Each structure stands twice: as C-alpha cells, then as structure tokens.
Amino acid sequence: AFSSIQNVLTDAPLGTPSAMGFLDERTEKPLMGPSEMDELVYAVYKQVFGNAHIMESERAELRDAESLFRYLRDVREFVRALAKSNAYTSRFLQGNQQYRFFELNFKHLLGRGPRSLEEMASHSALYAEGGFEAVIDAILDSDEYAQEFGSTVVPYCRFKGEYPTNEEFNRMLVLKGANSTSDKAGKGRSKLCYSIAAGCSQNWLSMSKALPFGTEKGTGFNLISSSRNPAARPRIGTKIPGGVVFSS
Amino acid sequence: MKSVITTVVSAADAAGRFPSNSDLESIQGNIQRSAARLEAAEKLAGNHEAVVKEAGDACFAKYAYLKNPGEAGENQEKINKCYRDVDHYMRLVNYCLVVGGTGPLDEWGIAGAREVYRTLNLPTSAYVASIAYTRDRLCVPRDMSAQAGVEFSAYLDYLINALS
Amino acid sequence: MKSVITTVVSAADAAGRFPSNSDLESIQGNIQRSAARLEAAEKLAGNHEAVVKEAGDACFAKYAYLKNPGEAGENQEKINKCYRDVDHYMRLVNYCLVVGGTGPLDEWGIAGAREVYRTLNLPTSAYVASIAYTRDRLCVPRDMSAQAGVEFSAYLDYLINALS
Amino acid sequence: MKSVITTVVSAADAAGRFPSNSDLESIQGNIQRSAARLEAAEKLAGNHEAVVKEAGDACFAKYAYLKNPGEAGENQEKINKCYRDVDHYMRLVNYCLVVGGTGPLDEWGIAGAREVYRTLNLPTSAYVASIAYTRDRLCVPRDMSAQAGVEFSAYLDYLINALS
Amino acid sequence: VSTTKADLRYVGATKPAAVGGRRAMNLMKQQPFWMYGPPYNAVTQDEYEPISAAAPKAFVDYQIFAPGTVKVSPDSVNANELNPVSGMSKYIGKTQKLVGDQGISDRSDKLPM
Amino acid sequence: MLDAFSRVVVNSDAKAAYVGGSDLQALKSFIADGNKRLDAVNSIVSNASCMVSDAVSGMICENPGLISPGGNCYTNRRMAACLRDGEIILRYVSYALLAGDASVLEDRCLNGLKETYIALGVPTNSSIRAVSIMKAQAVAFITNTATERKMSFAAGDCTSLASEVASYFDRVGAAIS
Amino acid sequence: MLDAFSRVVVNSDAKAAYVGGSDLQALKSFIADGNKRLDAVNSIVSNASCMVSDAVSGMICENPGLISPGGNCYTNRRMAACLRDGEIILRYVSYALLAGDASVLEDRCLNGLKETYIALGVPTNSSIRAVSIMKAQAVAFITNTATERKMSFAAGDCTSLASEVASYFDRVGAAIS
Amino acid sequence: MLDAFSRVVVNSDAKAAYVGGSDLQALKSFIADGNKRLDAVNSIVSNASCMVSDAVSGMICENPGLISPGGNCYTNRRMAACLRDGEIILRYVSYALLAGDASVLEDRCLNGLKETYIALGVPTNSSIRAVSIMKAQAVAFITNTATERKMSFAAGDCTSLASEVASYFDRVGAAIS
Numbered sequence A: 001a002f003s004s005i006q007n008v009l010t011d012a013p014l015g016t017p018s019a020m021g022f023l024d025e026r027t028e029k030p031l032m033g034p035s036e037m038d039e040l041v042y043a044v045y046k047q048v049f050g051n052a053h054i055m056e057s058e059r060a061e062l063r064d065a066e067s068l069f070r071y072l073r074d075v076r077e078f079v080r081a082l083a084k085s086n087a088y089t090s091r092f093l094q095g096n097q098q099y100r101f102f103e104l105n106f107k108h109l110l111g112r113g114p115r116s117l118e119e120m121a122s123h124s125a126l127y128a129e130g131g132f133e134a135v136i137d138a139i140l141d142s143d144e145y146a147q148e149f150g151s152t153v154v155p156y157c158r159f160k161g162e163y164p165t166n167e168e169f170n171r172m173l174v175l176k177g178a179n180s181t182s183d184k185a186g187k188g189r190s191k192l193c194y195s196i197a198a199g200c201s202q203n204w205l206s207m208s209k210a211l212p213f214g215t216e217k218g219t220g221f222n223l224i225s226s227s228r229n230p231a232a233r234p235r236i237g238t239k240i241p242g243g244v245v246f247s248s
Numbered sequence B, C, D: 001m002k003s004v005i006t007t008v009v010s011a012a013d014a015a016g017r018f019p020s021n022s023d024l025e026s027i028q029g030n031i032q033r034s035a036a037r038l039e040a041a042e043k044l045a046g047n048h049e050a051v052v053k054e055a056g057d058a059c060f061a062k063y064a065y066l067k068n069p070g071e072a073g074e075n076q077e078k079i080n081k082c083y084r085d086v087d088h089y090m091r092l093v094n095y096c097l098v099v100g101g102t103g104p105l106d107e108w109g110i111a112g113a114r115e116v117y118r119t120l121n122l123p124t125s126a127y128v129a130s131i132a133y134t135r136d137r138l139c140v141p142r143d144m145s146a147q148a149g150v151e152f153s154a155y156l157d158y159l160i161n162a163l164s
Numbered sequence E: 001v002s003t004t005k006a007d008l009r010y011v012g013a014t015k016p017a018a019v020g021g022r023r024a025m026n027l028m029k030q031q032p033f034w035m036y037g038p039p040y041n042a043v044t045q046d047e048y049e050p051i052s053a054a055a056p057k058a059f060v061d062y063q064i065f066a067p068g069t070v071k072v073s074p075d076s077v078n079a080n081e082l083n084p085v086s087g088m089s090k091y092i093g094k095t096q097k098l099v100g101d102q103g104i105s106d107r108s109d110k111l112p113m
Numbered sequence F, G, H: 001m002l003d004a005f006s007r008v009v010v011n012s013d014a015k016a017a018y019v020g021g022s023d024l025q026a027l028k029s030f031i032a033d034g035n036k037r038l039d040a041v042n043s044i045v046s047n048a049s050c051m052v053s054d055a056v057s058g059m060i061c062e063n064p065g066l067i068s069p070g071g072n073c074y075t076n077r078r079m080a081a082c083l084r085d086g087e088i089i090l091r092y093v094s095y096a097l098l099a100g101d102a103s104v105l106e107d108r109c110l111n112g113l114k115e116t117y118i119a120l121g122v123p124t125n126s127s128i129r130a131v132s133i134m135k136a137q138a139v140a141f142i143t144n145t146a147t148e149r150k151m152s153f154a155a156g157d158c159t160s161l162a163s164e165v166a167s168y169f170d171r172v173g174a175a176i177s
C-alpha cells in the first residue's frame, strides 16, 4: 500500500471539493461555479467514454445529465447517467463482443482489469437477469466502488501497489493504453479474452507502453521467451558446508 | 539459394548424374508442406507495416540508450534507418517462406552482416531484440495455423542464432 | 517533478486548453526569482564537501548511542552510508534550486522515506539534526546574499518538515 | 610474438639466408626507441590498479544500461569479470611496450575476440569506451614524457581499431 | 637475485605448523585485485589468523563517556567516490575485498606461537 | 514531463553530480532571452484557430481524393475529427515550446499514435502533409514574415526559436511516418 | 484456491472415485502432525519483519550496484517498493505452508509476475537472491537452529516442514526466471 | 554413413535375404513416429546457440581454473575454439538424431577425438562435464520442460526420442574419456 508510482509520477485525481457538503444545512456542496465546474465535466467525458471525442451534436443529448450534475454534485450519479446513454451503448455495446463490453466496464468505471474467469462469468450472470443495466448498476453500487471513489472523485486508474492478484495489474496496463489512444481501434474484439479464460498473461510491450514517464518502460526483457513454462521443474540447490542440498 | 530443389540438383551436378528416385522423392516434400508455409507468407505480407512497427519498438524499449547523443539512434534520419533495416529482415523471411529454405536469409541478410555492423558500431544485440520479440508474440491459432507458425518461427530462430 | 512550468501545463492539459495568458505570467516570475536561487545553488556546488562534512558529524556529536551493537552506525560502512545519505540530500537541495520547485526532493528523496527508514531502524531525529544544524549555520551577509538565503533556507525546512 | 627481432628473423628464414646488414640495422632502431617505450611500460606497471579502476567505471559512466536485467553488468561476479577483462587488456599493452611490437595483443587479446564477445553477448563498444577513456586521460608532460606518450597511445588505439 | 626482506619471510615457512604457528602461511603471495572475488575466491592471509574470527559478547556502551570524547570520521564525503555507477566500491558492500593490497600481512612481528 | 531546467538535473543525477558553474551558463542564457520564449508562444496560440483551418484545407488541395467516398475525411463526422486532431497536435507542440523540451510531446501525444492510425485507416502519408503545412506557418509567425497579421514585436531575432519549434514539428512528422 | 484436503478430492474427481481408506492415510497424518504445522508458521510470522529487511539488505551487500545511480533499488521511491515486494512474497508462502498446497502462491502472487518485472525493469537474478536468503532463514526458525532467537518448542523433528517450505520458496524463482 | 533404413538392409544382405515380413512391419512403425523425430530435431537446432554458450559457461563456473592464467580456456584465441569445439559436437549429434543412427557421429567426430585432445593438452575431464550439460538441455527441450522457454507441439509423448538423444550424448562422453 505504498505504491511508488501513484502520486509521484502521475497526477493527483480530480473531483469535487469535499464530501461534507452533503451534511450541510443550507447547501448541497461547496459550489464550484461554471469555470471550475465544466473542467470537472471534461474529465468525466474523457474517462467514461475513453478518448472517443464526442461531437457537438453528440454532446447535445447529454444535456439532461449535465444539468442535474450541477444541482446534485454527486459524481457517481453522473457516471451512472452516462453509462445508460445511447452514446455509451453505441460505442461499447453495439459492435463489440460480450467480453469486450465487460472489460471496458472495468476500465471506464473501476480503473482496473478483471481478475478472474469466475468474476467475469458472474457479470454475464447479471446480463441474463436484467440486461446491461444490471451490469452497470452492480459495478456502481459495489463495495469496491465505494471505498475507492465514493461520490467525490472521478473513477481514475489507480496504481495501488497491493493488488489482490499480480495479474490484475497486468490487465489494467493493457486496458488503459497510452495517451491519445481510444477504445475503438481493435475491431470489436476483446484484448484480455484469451488470458482470462486460459489463465495466462499479457505481452510486456503492450503493458510498458502505458506506464508513466520515469518507470524504465520495457527494460528487463531477456532476449529469450517472455512467459513461464508451467511444465518445467528446475533444480535449485543451496550450498551448505558439505555439499549442495536440493530441497525439492 | 539453399532450397529443396537446389540442394538435390547441386548434389547430383557435383556427382555428374541424372535426377534419381531419391531426388524426386524430396520434391514431394516440397508439395506436402507448401500449403503451411505459403499461408504463413501471405499473412506476413498483408500485415507487414504493423509488425515491423511493433518489432522495431522493442529494440528502442529495452535499449533505450540508443537515442542518447552519440549512439546509433542519435538523430531522426538514423531512427528510420533502423525501421528500414528491420523491414529488410522481415521481407527476407517472407522470401524464405516462399522459396522453401534459408537461401534469401543466407545470401542477402546474414552473409557479411557481422563485418558491416562491427565497422559501423551497430550493436547486433538490438538487431536481435526486434526479432526475438516477433518470435514470442505469436499466438498459435490466432495469427496463423499450427504448422504455419512452426515454419515462421523457425526462420526467426535461424536469424537469431546467426546473429549470435 | 513539481516545477513552475510543470504545473501550469499539467493544468492546461487537465482542461484541454492552450498556453493561457495566465501561464505566461507564471514564467515571468521564473525570470525574477531565478537570480537568488541560482546564486544560492552555485554557492552550494563549490562548497559541498565542507557543508556535508559539518552536517554529518552534527549527528554523531549529538547521538553517541549510534555506535552501540545493533544501532544505525555500528560499523564503518554504516558511517560511510550515513555521510552518503546527507550528501544525497543536499544534492537534491541543489537540484531544487535549479528547477525552482520542490520536484527533485519529493520524487527522489522524500517519497518512500517514511517506509524505508522505519524498516531499517534509521532514526528520523538524527536525519533532522543534521539538516537542522546547517539551517542555522547560514549567515545571511557572509555566506550568500540576503534573498539567496531565503531560497536556500526554504528547501531546507521543507525537508525538516516532511521528515518529521 | 610480432616484434622487430621476430619479423626480420622470419623474413630471413623464409628466404633462407643469414642475418644481413639490413637485419642488423633494424635492431638498432630497437635500441634508440627503447628509452621511450620502457618509460611508459614502467609508469604503467607501478600505477596499474589505479589506471584500471579509473577506466573500469568509465564504461559504466557512459553505458548505465548494463545494470538492467539480462545485461553484462547485473551482479557482482559480472563486474568482477569486467574489471578483470580490462586489467587483462592493460597487461597486454604493458607487454607490447616491453617486446616492442603488437605481438601479445594479437595472439592473446584480439584473435578470437569477435566470436567470444558475440557468443556471450558482451557489447564490444564497451570494451572500447574504457580503452578510449585512458587514451584521452593521458597528459603528455605530467604522467610520462613526450615520446613515451606517443608509444603509449599508439598501442592504445591499435586495440581500438582492432575491436572496431 | 633475491632480497633480504623476501628470504626472511619465506624461512619461517620451513618449520612445522606445530612449531611455526602463524608463519606456516608465509609462502603465499599477493595476487591481482579481481582474484579475490566471486568466481575465484582467493583467501587472504588475514583470514588464517585469529583476528578474523573475533566476535565477543561484550560491547562498549558509548553513553558512559562525556560528550566530546567519541570521534567519527568517514572515508569520503562524495557519493560516486563511495559507490560508483558500477558496484566496484572500496567502502560499501562485498566489493571492498577487491583491492591490490592486503592479501598478505605481518605475522613475523611477534613469535612462532 | 521534464522542462528545460529539469533536463539538466536528470543528466547530472546520472553522474551523481552537483549542477556546477558550467551548466549554469546554459541556464542563465535560457532566462536571458527568456522573454522571447513568452513573446513568441503568444504568437502561435493567438493564430491557432486559423492555423488548424488552413492546414487541413491545404491537405485537401494536394490530395483531392480524400473527399472521395472511401477517402478518410469524406463525411462530416470524419472531417470534424480530422480538425480536432490538428488541434491536439498543435496543443502539445505549444506546450513543448513553452517547456523547452519535447518530453511532454513524446509521452502524452506521440506514444502509440502510428500504432493506432493504421488501426483506423488514417492515411499517414497525407497526415504528414497536414502537419508540415502548419509547420511552415508557425515559423513565419515567429519570424514575423507573414503576409497578413503583422503582429508588433521588439527588434532582434527569433531565428533559434523558429528552429526549435521546427524540430518539434519534425518529431511528430517522423513519428507517424 | 485449494488446500491439502482439497487437492486430494480433485484428484479423485478425475476418476470419479471415493476418498477411501487407502487415500485417507495421507490425510490422517496431515492432521496427526497438524500441531507442528501451526507451531512452525508462528515461528515465521513472529520474525517476519526482521526476515524481510535482512534479505533485502543482504542482497544489496552482495551487489552494490543496486544502490548506485542506475540501480533499481536506488532512491527511497524504489527501495520501499522492493521492501514491500519481499513482504508480499513472504506473506503468500506463509499461506501456502499453512494450507499445505502451493495453489494460492501460484495463481495470486506468481501468475503474471514475470511480465511485470520485464516491463518495470526489475532485475530478476538479484530478486531471486532476496528470496533465497529468506528461504535459508526460514528453515533456521523452523528447525530452531538460528544463531540469535531461540524459540520455545517441543522436541522432535520438523524436517519435513522445513523442506516443504523450501519448495514453496523455489517456486518463486522458477516463475520469474 | 548409415541411416536407420540402411542398417536393416546391411543386416539383411549378410544372410542374402529379401527385406519383408516382420522387419517390414518394424519399419512401418518407425515412419509412424517420423513426425515426432522431425518435430524434435527442430526443437534443438532452434536453440543451438544458447545451448552451447550455457554449457561452456557452466563448465567454467564449476572449474574456474580454466579461466585462470595458464588455464586451457584462458586467452581469447582459446576461448573461441572451445565455443567452436563444443558446437561441432552438438551439430554432429543433431545429424544422428535426424538419421536415427549414430554412425555419422562415431566416425566423423568421435574416432580419434581423445587422442587429439590429449595431444593439444585439452582437459578431457572438463569436456565430459560440458557434454553432460548439453545432455540435460536436449532432454529438456525434447520433453518441453525447459525453464527458460516453452515451445509449441501437438499433444503426445516423446520419451523414446529423449532416451535416444541421451544415449548419443553419453556416447560422446564415453568416447573422449
């Protein structure tokens, strides 16, 4: 839980001023005003849609969820209203596979990649009982969304240091790309799909393109193979005074 | 060119004899395996400008010191000469998949290579790191078939052992 | 690397804007306060052997218990690693006076130091006593200029605050 | 060894003749030149541990990438073999100033070196950067005399041109 | 073309080790600096002595003394003089045995005990 | 990102050296004419609305099969996304002219761009011509040799600032090549 | 994940067998020596903070180029991340010694670890050396043959737990090599 | 030079018999495994330069007197010849694995190698010790249990080609004894 990259080599996460405006008697929030309000909206449009670069006549159908975001200043409600939009399902649901849609919900709304096939198959168990809005509100009303973001900050891609699987950091680095990438370049097909269902891992150059500036992006590659052999049993022995003991 | 055809002809031309039954028996193996290595070749031919971009970034990822002032990737006109020389090597692997042997890699890529890269202070370990990255970024049913990847990754293993 | 330039365009990129007419004023302050923080930096560069010899034995004149068995300076490479770790710190103080912000300190010296020094039993109060010795060793007409002592004794007690 | 004596003896052995008047005239050049090249061989043999270690970390001051994983300066054994292999080369230059030719450098340091530094993947431009640092470190009146430094540097860039 | 200092050292190595004591290891010589490290692992002459195996349970407390009477000097105050970009350091780590001196010592000072 | 002062710091930390008296004559001569860096980044972003418009409209007039059906900037949703891509390219160049170093241009813009312009079918041989038109227009604003918009400056030269920004447009022009 | 009883019933599920009295005599001795498995894991978690810092600083001792400029334990930023990582490795092998099966070490900790390290730049030969010091100091606490810190046990052999945990530490080296 | 087909004809020519019957049915099953043999020669030639530099380095780490002054692998002229002497042995074993008969190994490489090495002063103890390392590498590559690289094959068993390639490498060590 130290995480040497997070507030050092990246920026600080954006969001509303505090969470004490909810308990105020005569306001709803420290009111930003329309110069420090709309530049928070620029970071929700950049995070939920990828870098999709929505036009003026595509932003004109999100006027109702913005106008509510400047009254209730809840960030979880703005993200929930933008994921049930037509502009979220015409980019990430319409021309994609099912595990491509699921792996972008972990990117746009959690800042991590899915850790398992069992965690991924339960997201398709919620598709059968309520469609795509049952997937979206179960991510948003989870415990993992509460104790990292709350109503206060935008859901950003967080370098934690103490990931519950090491593979979770790998799929986070493939999903989040470099700056000036987007989520439409692969033609519908899921990047992480072979590695979730088999249990293998990712490619080192695809992860190190997305690391921040100052992290030795790519060195350490020996010129032999990049993954491990599960069938190999090596002999690793330790020297004692007399000989060498192979505690295998 | 080292091939299946030019090996059995030169073995019979040096002995002064006609093509016998064993010399025709080996051209039959050029028919039973032409299918696998030719759809490994047209897969590489149609998707070559995306592979040599991904491969040539793997040498400037591990050996990032080459863009320092003084080294072989010092300015801009020397960086695209590295991407040119990697596109040369991927084009010659396409020729060895067409011919059926290591001929176009021997005669055009390997012979005289170590004398050139030593005289011009080019590290041969970074003409390798772009090639060894292409060899392990190869999935078995996705990029090509099963036996098309065995052929394709054998001319990459040939170039790795020849530069080392 | 928090500088003056690397904050006004990390806010110009966070809203997707051009270089504003606000931010062309923030580099006009980089022209004014440079000549007190460059002249404080160049004084530290030609005098650094003498200021870290004096700062390091301010730890050991104060804390004689560190040579006990199991303590921090219990043998001679630990004394050599103590004077290294105060040669590192005032090198970063020399770096912060060049770029004008606290960027090289909190990227290379402060981040991690709560967690490193706790695990290795290196006391924070001995690191503070070396740096707080040379904060009031500064003599404002003798050593450097009047405002040059303000810049040099701003990064010093930034490090005394962040360690404590 | 290629020397002045062994050249003129082998030339008069292949011709099958006695030492002529021109073969004794070459050994007189070995007398008038021995004063300069034995001063350099004695200056080097007294201060060799400080010349080797000053040039051993001039490799890693130019190429800091050698401490990356998989490289040639990873662990303690690999830098012990690196400072050894530089000390081997400086011993052979001491042997070449004594003999008077490029004999010991050819048979013991240069022949077979291209095939070893490529098989074991040691970057040959870093067995050069230590040799090129010593050639420009030499002050021509300070360490040796004028003609002793001409002989010392001429064997130092014979090794550079043989690795390049 | 021998010397008096060399022949006074080697003549202590002709007694038996039940008689000669520390002088039985007087035939060993000074090697190059790289010979003492990790593939080769040559033993210095100080490691055959009982001074290399000194580890007492007692210790000086250093808070008994008056302030001003404990002295500490470093070897350098410079970071790339104490440890370079390579790991070849005279002061920090396991590479401080890689030095051109200190393979041999003086055990002809005292006695054959 | 690193600016022009923090580049000199990360070179000297590789040596573990203090920033002495020899490197400070390149940083006192950065801030000596450092008015002119502010006095010429202002004369890109003042004309930067017109500069992206004349860039891509001259990209049409030399490759007129871009507006043919099948061409990349055929319809209206693609002509708008081509126009904002010249905005983002011009934005991260004007950061790097303010910073003195191409660190914020290469990490936040050029990393992975040619990788994805082949993945969307953007013809990069005519996207290079999009960059190099506004490269020519920016270096005559700084030189004050434009026909219209004679912006009043102070007398001297910005011949090195005109060539530092021409190196920045050649960094993007070589990245997507 | 699995433990030592769950590993037996997934072997019998491949043959649709019943776990009977032939197969149960390995599990009847896992509970018979089950006091000593608990008695060995609080010999490790009682000394775990001393064990990590000795193993990481003992790797710096045999390799001083890890703390020079360009090493990957250089600053405070990188050294605290190395100290965190060796505590994570020692945590997952104490779970695996407690269960009696190396499943949870192999999928959560070790799966995908080799690709993190060749993207961040972590040297894997010296990282294996920090694990191999803390392998050697883990068999000393279990067999109570450590030079300081004698703990209070009962008498008998724990020589099969000491080589079971030495094989769990050997899987970390085999997965990042 | 005999292959596996020439051996069963020489054996049949001694009694003047036509090849047919039971030894024609033993030959039809030799070609049924003919793709496994072709799959496995490729898995050694592909890794042939790392197999040699690891076996020569591993012979050196066991006996560091070969790289001392006066050792047999001391100078650069002699280091390059041991790296050449050691890959000719691997090259001639790959001929015998492709042919399925050790005749070409025994007469073009092994006949007189012991008398050659004890005439040049080459230690035959260390040459055996490098050949036995290359044996352990070739059985690991054929059975696909290398810890450094896993290849792609069809599923099945190739433990008879590992028993055969170990017999060729044992014969190299017994010949130069």
Ligand SMILES: *[C@@H](C)[C@H]1/C(=C/C2=NC(=C\c3[nH]c(C[C@H]4NC(=O)C(C=C)=C4C)c(C)c3CCC(=O)O)/C(CCC(=O)O)=C2C)NC(=O)[C@@H]1C
Pocket (backbone or CB within 6 Å): B056, B059, B066, B071, B072, B073, B078, B079, B081, B082, B083, B085, B086, B088, B089, B108, B109, B116, B120, B122, B123, B126, B127, B130
């Ligand atoms: C980046 C990958 C490398 C690097 C590469 C460079 N290679 C350079 C020149 C070069 N390459 C070849 C071989 C190539 N040319 C061919 O005709 C064929 C086969 C048909 C092949 C494989 C040659 C002959 C040359 C020299 C002539 C030339 O310039 O093309 C090169 C230019 C060197 C120079 O101009 O001085 C570079 C920069 N360099 C790097 O930084 C990493 C190691």
Ligand SMILES: *[C@@H](C)[C@H]1/C(=C/C2=NC(=C\c3[nH]c(C[C@H]4NC(=O)C(C=C)=C4C)c(C)c3CCC(=O)O)/C(CCC(=O)O)=C2C)NC(=O)[C@@H]1C
Pocket (backbone or CB within 6 Å): E093, E094, G047, G050, G051, G054, G055, G057, G058, G059, G060, G061, G062, G132, G133, G136, G137, G140, G141, G145, G146, G147, G148, G149
């Ligand atoms: C914390 C101090 C524990 C403790 C741990 C043990 N360490 C044991 C062995 C050991 N420690 C080191 C590192 C040490 N040696 C060095 O050369 C340097 C500096 C460069 C350091 C810090 C090494 C290398 C080893 C040996 C491992 C190996 O041989 O590869 C150990 C084993 C038995 C013993 O020596 O006691 C233990 C138990 N010891 C303690 O009592 C406290 C609780």
Ligand SMILES: *[C@@H](C)[C@H]1/C(=C/C2=NC(=C\c3[nH]c(C[C@H]4NC(=O)C(C=C)=C4C)c(C)c3CCC(=O)O)/C(CCC(=O)O)=C2C)NC(=O)[C@@H]1C
Pocket (backbone or CB within 6 Å): G032, G033, G034, G035, G036, G038, G039, G040, G042, G142, G143, G144, G153, G154, G155, G156, G157, G158
């Ligand atoms: C090997 C590691 C030791 C050693 C071990 C033995 N321990 C034996 C018994 C034992 N240990 C504990 C405490 C343990 N059991 C628990 O349930 C918990 C925590 C909840 C802990 C820490 C107990 C209770 C016992 C049983 C005896 C008793 O109740 O007093 C033991 C006896 C064999 C057995 O009964 O299993 C051995 C040999 N003794 C050694 O000499 C080495 C160093």
Ligand SMILES: *[C@@H](C)[C@H]1/C(=C/C2=NC(=C\c3[nH]c(C[C@H]4NC(=O)C(C=C)=C4C)c(C)c3CCC(=O)O)/C(CCC(=O)O)=C2C)NC(=O)[C@@H]1C
Pocket (backbone or CB within 6 Å): A224, A232, A234, A235, H047, H050, H051, H054, H055, H057, H058, H060, H061, H062, H133, H136, H137, H140, H141, H145, H146, H147, H148, H149
């Ligand atoms: C080359 C990089 C190949 C590769 C070859 C393999 N080597 C295998 C085992 C092995 N290697 C050595 C030498 C090594 N050990 C040392 O102690 C030293 C230095 C002192 C060195 C250089 C030995 C001794 C052995 C083991 C012999 C035995 O088992 O008795 C091996 C086996 C399996 C595996 O490691 O996966 C292979 C395949 N390994 C690679 O990954 C690349 C492709």
Ligand SMILES: *[C@H](C)[C@H]1/C(=C/C2=NC(=C\c3[nH]c(C[C@H]4NC(=O)C(C=C)=C4C)c(C)c3CCC(=O)O)/C(CCC(=O)O)=C2C)NC(=O)[C@@H]1C
Pocket (backbone or CB within 6 Å): A063, A064, A065, A066, A067, A068, A069, A070, A071
């Ligand atoms: C124009 C006819 C009025 C007037 C309008 C203003 N409304 C402002 C904010 C606002 N309006 C609504 C209602 C509408 N927006 C919705 O999203 C929905 C439901 C889907 C409805 C019916 C809401 C909820 C809000 C608050 C959200 C927001 O802050 O924009 C408004 C701005 C005030 C402000 O910024 O606080 C104006 C000026 N006001 C007028 O004077 C004329 C008569």
Ligand SMILES: *[C@H](C)[C@H]1/C(=C/C2=NC(=C\c3[nH]c(C[C@H]4NC(=O)C(C=C)=C4C)c(C)c3CCC(=O)O)/C(CCC(=O)O)=C2C)NC(=O)[C@@H]1C
Pocket (backbone or CB within 6 Å): A186, A191, A192, A193, A194, A195, A198, A200, A203, A206, B043, B044, B045, B047, B050, B051, B054, B134, B137, B138, B139, B140, B142, B143
């Ligand atoms: C295989 C066991 C894995 C797997 C790996 C993935 N590869 C991905 C993309 C990709 N791979 C290549 C190289 C390969 N394809 C080719 O066409 C050729 C040459 C003819 C080669 C060597 C390329 C060029 C690309 C990028 C193009 C694309 O978008 O597909 C990939 C997607 C993520 C990424 O690497 O960008 C994966 C996941 N895929 C699997 O399902 C199994 C598990």
Ligand SMILES: *[C@H](C)[C@H]1/C(=C/C2=NC(=C\c3[nH]c(C[C@H]4NC(=O)C(C=C)=C4C)c(C)c3CCC(=O)O)/C(CCC(=O)O)=C2C)NC(=O)[C@@H]1C
Pocket (backbone or CB within 6 Å): C059, C066, C072, C073, C078, C079, C081, C082, C083, C085, C086, C088, C089, C108, C109, C116, C120, C122, C123, C126, C127, C130, G057, G060, G067, G074, G075, G076, G079
């Ligand atoms: C002297 C005032 C101290 C003292 C210090 C010791 N520090 C030890 C190690 C150490 N110091 C640092 C921070 C330093 N390294 C850097 O790279 C930078 C910035 C670029 C800084 C400021 C680190 C990270 C470490 C640990 C790693 C190492 O050995 O280099 C140290 C040795 C630790 C140990 O005993 O195991 C000592 C003794 N000693 C004192 O008595 C006072 C408190």
Ligand SMILES: *[C@H](C)[C@H]1/C(=C/C2=NC(=C\c3[nH]c(C[C@H]4NC(=O)C(C=C)=C4C)c(C)c3CCC(=O)O)/C(CCC(=O)O)=C2C)NC(=O)[C@@H]1C
Pocket (backbone or CB within 6 Å): D043, D044, D045, D047, D050, D051, D054, D134, D137, D138, D139, D140, D142, D143
């Ligand atoms: C001449 C260019 C300059 C000058 C240069 C300095 N050299 C300094 C030290 C120094 N130089 C050498 C190399 C030289 N001495 C040798 O014994 C041999 C070969 C046997 C060579 C090539 C060495 C080894 C050293 C370090 C030992 C020492 O002299 O203290 C020097 C002192 C600073 C430094 O440590 O480099 C300077 C200034 N000196 C001059 O006066 C003229 C102008």
Ligand SMILES: *[C@H](C)[C@H]1/C(=C/C2=NC(=C\c3[nH]c(C[C@H]4NC(=O)C(C=C)=C4C)c(C)c3CCC(=O)O)/C(CCC(=O)O)=C2C)NC(=O)[C@@H]1C
Pocket (backbone or CB within 6 Å): E049, E050, E051, E052
């Ligand atoms: C401490 C209160 C003294 C003091 C002692 C030093 N003694 C040094 C070396 C040394 N001491 C002995 C005698 C010791 N060895 C025995 O076998 C017996 C009795 C059976 C005794 C009392 C010997 C033989 C030696 C030399 C052997 C060796 O060096 O290992 C010593 C080291 C000096 C040096 O080598 O520089 C010290 C400092 N010194 C003091 O100042 C107080 C008075």
Ligand SMILES: *[C@H](C)[C@H]1/C(=C/C2=NC(=C\c3[nH]c(C[C@H]4NC(=O)C(C=C)=C4C)c(C)c3CCC(=O)O)/C(CCC(=O)O)=C2C)NC(=O)[C@@H]1C
Pocket (backbone or CB within 6 Å): A003, A004, A005, A006, A159, A160, A161, A162, A163, A164, A165, A166, A169, A214, A215, A216, G056, G066, G072, G073, G077, G078, G079, G081, G082, G083, G085, G086, G088, G089, G108, G109, G113, G116, G120, G122, G123, G126, G127, G130
């Ligand atoms: C120390 C023994 C090593 C070393 C370690 C470094 N690790 C760095 C980052 C890092 N490490 C991990 C793996 C760790 N985290 C986990 O969650 C799990 C499994 C549950 C493990 C094993 C991750 C995932 C990361 C990146 C995440 C993050 O830190 O934010 C690191 C920092 C590199 C940098 O600053 O660029 C270091 C230095 N490095 C060494 O040299 C020794 C050998």
Ligand SMILES: C=CC1=C(C)[C@@H](Cc2[nH]c(/C=C3N=C(/C=C4\NC(=O)[C@H](C)[C@H]4CC)C(C)=C\3CCC(=O)O)c(CCC(=O)O)c2C)NC1=O
Pocket (backbone or CB within 6 Å): A051, A052, A053, A179, A180, A181, A182, A183, A184, F056, F066, F072, F073, F077, F078, F079, F081, F082, F083, F085, F086, F088, F089, F108, F109, F113, F116, F120, F122, F123, F126, F127, F130
């Ligand atoms: C920060 C880095 C960064 C950039 C540099 C740009 C790069 C960029 N451009 C486009 C997207 C595009 N880019 C172009 C651009 C061009 N086509 C042409 O004919 C011209 C040659 C050229 C510029 C005039 C076009 C036409 C599209 C639209 C393609 C589409 O609609 O699918 C996309 C995909 C966005 C999406 O729709 O999801 C991205 C990431 N955006 C970024 O985020």
Ligand SMILES: C=CC1=C(C)[C@@H](Cc2[nH]c(/C=C3N=C(/C=C4\NC(=O)[C@H](C)[C@H]4CC)C(C)=C\3CCC(=O)O)c(CCC(=O)O)c2C)NC1=O
Pocket (backbone or CB within 6 Å): F047, F050, F051, F054, F055, F057, F058, F059, F060, F061, F062, F132, F133, F134, F136, F137, F138, F139, F140, F141, F145, F146, F147, F148, F149
């Ligand atoms: C096919 C159709 C077609 C066009 C749309 C124009 C587009 C166009 N304009 C200019 C050329 C220019 N563009 C500008 C920029 C501006 N000029 C002003 O008066 C404003 C202040 C500012 C924004 C409009 C300037 C100043 C030049 C002249 C060259 C220069 O001085 O840099 C160039 C030359 C760039 C080059 O040489 O590479 C081109 C192609 N020309 C064409 O052939």
Ligand SMILES: C=CC1=C(C)[C@@H](Cc2[nH]c(/C=C3N=C(/C=C4\NC(=O)[C@H](C)[C@H]4CC)C(C)=C\3CCC(=O)O)c(CCC(=O)O)c2C)NC1=O
Pocket (backbone or CB within 6 Å): C021, C024, C025, C028, F032, F033, F034, F035, F036, F038, F039, F040, F042, F142, F143, F144, F153, F154, F155, F156, F157, F158, F161
């Ligand atoms: C907040 C916003 C902000 C700015 C816009 C600039 C504004 C600005 N520019 C200059 C000053 C100047 N500007 C120029 C530049 C030029 N003169 C020419 O004829 C060339 C065409 C052109 C080159 C690009 C020169 C030559 C000077 C004076 C010399 C100098 O100090 O650099 C000066 C100093 C006053 C002077 O020297 O006259 C100021 C305040 N500074 C700021 O702080």
Ligand SMILES: C=CC1=C(C)[C@@H](Cc2[nH]c(/C=C3N=C(/C=C4\NC(=O)[C@H](C)[C@H]4CC)C(C)=C\3CCC(=O)O)c(CCC(=O)O)c2C)NC1=O
Pocket (backbone or CB within 6 Å): B033, B146, B147, B150, H032, H033, H034, H035, H036, H038, H039, H040, H042, H142, H143, H144, H153, H154, H155, H156, H157, H158, H159, H161
């Ligand atoms: C000219 C180039 C050329 C080659 C490289 C080989 C390539 C090759 N290998 C196999 C086929 C095979 N290869 C293996 C070999 C192995 N499987 C293992 O599990 C072991 C790790 C390894 C060595 C024992 C096995 C078991 C088969 C299955 C068929 C068989 O048993 O013969 C096949 C047939 C199956 C298929 O069509 O996919 C082919 C073509 N043949 C050629 O003609």
